[PDB]
Amino acid sequence: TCPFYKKIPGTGFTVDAFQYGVVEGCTAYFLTHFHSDHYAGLSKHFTFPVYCSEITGNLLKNKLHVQEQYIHPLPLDTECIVNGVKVVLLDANHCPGAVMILFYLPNGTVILHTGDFRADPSMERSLLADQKVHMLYLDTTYCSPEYTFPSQQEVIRFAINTAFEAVTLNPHALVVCGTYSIGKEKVFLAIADVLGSKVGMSQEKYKTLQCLNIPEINSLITTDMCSSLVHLLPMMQINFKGLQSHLKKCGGKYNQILAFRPTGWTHSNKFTRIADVIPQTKGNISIYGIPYSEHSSYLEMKRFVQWLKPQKIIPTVNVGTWKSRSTMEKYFREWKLEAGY
């Protein structure tokens, strides 16, 4: 049944709650972003109002064929009224079109639902600065102190420098980047930019990217693989077998692959700096695992929460085990006692 952490008290609202059939008493279904664990259950047969960002609304219409009459896109940073309740959508610094949602309940309670987010100090200057938030529904994906990772900027610098060096040393090397969802477009777009290439990809992935309102996108991507030396493939194919196979398909245009797998966290983060990352190599194929995250590190999450000073926190991630739940609640209490709220 629908878990309590997907329901907004004092409203008929749910958040990211599309796989439970008809949720009894739900008058509006919000969708924070277009990732499958969150949209699971939507299709052209859905006949209740869906509230979301413009970009998420483009993906619902074009990829899932949800009918236009049930899609209610809202502008960001704008006070809107939904079934008699004031709401605001804020940028979540996750994937394209991902939002956080502020609810202003008729009784005076204010609730922030982060959806999935990568906390950033820039959030401390949005419409959140203007009033008190009483309850926080928090993306706790990496809520433990072992989870450190570099900035997105440092990671993209590493990838750009690595790719440019490899291809300038060998003009017959191919660059391959893995993907299995929207998000992390900077990785492949920044590499293609330094190499003076467009990124080549399947028709399905090109269609997905054409929904994202990225500026000048027609100048950066293509379905013509032969004219591109940065290829995008399914994350599944980023392994030595899958890459050897792909190289056969390019007809001796290329004699080396350099491949990137933008993982979330991996335990080489506890020891190794970004400057010091090395690939796995077999023959003329090398694979780099790079820690490009679109979720908060533990320190980024802690700074956000200690700034916001919520009265109650409701985790939305890692909630399935008692040991996880208990550990998270211990961190929340530490943070509250250190900061004095």
Chain contacts with Ni ion (rule: CB under 5 A) = 35, 116
Shortest distance, position 293 Cβ to Ni ion, whole Å: 11
297/184 Cα distance (integer angstroms): 16
Q: Which is nearer to Ni ion, 118 or 231 (CB)?
A: 118
Q: How far is the CB of 267 from Ni ion (least distance, A)?
A: 22
Q: List the beta bridge partners of residue 177.
A: 232, 260
H helices of 250-293, in order, are none
Measured from the CB atom, the residue of 33 and 302 that comes closer to Ni ion is: 33
Instruction: Report the residue number, 35 or 118, with the smaller CB distance to Ni ion.
Output: 35
What is the distance between the alpha carbons of residues 241 and 186, in angstroms, rounded to a whole number?
26
Least distance in Å: CB of 318 to Ni ion? 14
- In this structure, the strands spanning 173-179 and 256-262 are parallel
> Shortest CA distance to 294 belongs to which of 175, 37, 117, 62?
117
CB 173, min distance to Ni ion, A? 32
CA nearest 101: which of 48, 56, 63, 67?
Answer: 56
Beta carbon nearer to Ni ion, 180 or 341: 180
The Cα 270–Cα 293 span in angstroms is: 15
Q: Dihedrals φ, ψ of 230, to 5°?
A: -120, 110
Strand partners, 86: 81, 104
Q: Which is nearer to Ni ion, 23 or 116 (CB)?
A: 116
CB 31, min distance to Ni ion, A: 11
The per-residue b/e assignment along 94-113, b for 16 or more CB within 10 angstroms, e otherwise, is bbbbbbbbbbbbeeeebbbb
To the nearest whole angstrom, how small is the minimum distance from the Cβ of residue 49 to Ni ion? 22
Residue 36 or 272: the one with the smaller Cβ distance to Ni ion is 36
Residue 116 vs 185, nearer CB to Ni ion: 116
How far apart, in whole angstroms, are the C-alpha atoms of residue 107 and residue 318?
30
Residues 33, 50: Cα–Cα separation, whole Å: 12
CB of 70 to Ni ion, least distance (A): 22
| Alpha-carbon gap, residue 146 to 48, rounded angstroms | 41
